[PDB]
Design a protein around this ligand. Structure first.
Ligand SMILES: CC1(C)c2[nH]c3cc(Cl)c(Cl)cc3c2C[C@@]23CN4CCC[C@]4(C[C@@H]12)C(=O)N3
Ligand SMILES: [Ca+2]
Ligand SMILES: [Ca+2]
Ligand SMILES: [Ca+2]
Ligand SMILES: [Ca+2]
Ligand SMILES: [Zn+2]
Length: 142
């Protein structure tokens, strides 16, 4: 929803007391304690680490959407990698062929040669079927 998001940026701004675009443990604890909870500092750090995709100890708005989605960061990252994968998997069959890779990359401004493309598919083609599936796409990227 679009207004579910607008609600969420409202929430984020409230929690981000000082407006610097990040939520700290202290800001998080203030909110938790205002709702009748007594989380330890370790527990507050844990809440943050669970969505802390960039590893900087604070929550920004994109990581907060993970938290509002309630999710863990690996789950969230998997859903984002799958969205990138579907950009390349034009026919939607679950495999990035060499032609799909060449086509999408060209239309995104990167034209590689034919044998660059064939080697990119080869490199990430673990099981040797000639195409790049999702798990191979994840691996390729790490
Ligand atoms: C040139 C890159 C490294 C790459 N190399 C590939 C090899 C294969 Cl086999 C396939 Cl299918 C796709 C790619 C892509 C698309 C990528 C994925 N990377 C993730 C982080 C940055 C970057 C760079 C770029 C990105 O944003 N787009
Ligand atoms: Ca802040
Ligand atoms: Ca962060
Ligand atoms: Ca495909
Ligand atoms: Ca494969
Ligand atoms: Zn995310």
């Amino acid at each position: 929803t679009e207004e579910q998001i607008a609600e969420f940026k409202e929430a984020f701004s409230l929690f981000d007391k000082d407006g610097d675009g990040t939520i700290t443990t202290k800001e998080l604890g203030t909110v938790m304690r205002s709702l009748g909870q007594n989380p330890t500092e370790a527990e507050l750090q844990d809440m943050i680490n669970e969505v802390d995709a960039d590893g900087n100890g604070t929550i920004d708005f994109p990581e907060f959407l993970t938290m509002m989605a309630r999710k863990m960061k690996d789950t969230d990252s998997e859903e984002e990698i799958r969205e990138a994968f579907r950009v390349f998997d034009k026919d939607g069959n679950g495999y990035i062929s060499a032609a799909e890779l060449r086509h999408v990359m060209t239309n995104l401004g990167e034209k590689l040669t034919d044998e660059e493309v064939d080697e990119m598919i080869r490199e990430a083609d673990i099981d040797g079927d000639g195409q790049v599936n999702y798990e191979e796409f994840v691996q390729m990227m790490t």
